[PDB]
Symmetry: C3
């Protein structure tokens, strides 16, 4: 229990401040970004080998 509260409560004083709220929401925004991008990258990386080669890029760019 209270896992989320502890995670926003960055200094662990048992209270959530405005700074920590601000910082949490920044953190969350960036993660959702990390995760959209990683999903898109996932999709273009056809052979799923971790890099995008000219063939995979071409297949993608050539669809827009």
């Amino acid at each position: 229990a209270e896992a989320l509260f502890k995670e926003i409560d960055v200094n662990g004083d048992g209270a959530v401040s405005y700074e920590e709220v601000k910082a949490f929401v920044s953190k969350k925004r960036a993660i959702k970004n990390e995760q959209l991008l990683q999903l898109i990258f996932k999709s273009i990386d056809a052979d799923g080998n971790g890099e995008i080669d000219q063939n995979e890029f071409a297949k993608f760019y050539g669809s827009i």
Copy 2:
């Protein structure tokens, strides 16, 4: 008069440049953000004592 113009005219040369425009719009974006966040924080801080405790957080998190 000219208060806004003076505020964007950061170097005070009597002309507004592209840099200053760019910087003003950044500034404004951040303030509107500061103010949405502060309003939201305001709303979760039920007892309005400046910090969010586990009871106030729980009341909030438990509504989504």
Copy 3:
């Protein structure tokens, strides 16, 4: 040929990584921003002399 691929492929190893994708999309976001702002600035800079004076600013601010 492959101009775009070379441009995202920042380290030139012939493969596009997740970092480079991330960085490209940041770059693109900022350019579209640079270009909206520059177009807006363009429009307020009536005499198109590169700075915005109080008369041009007034004409603009006084339309909102």
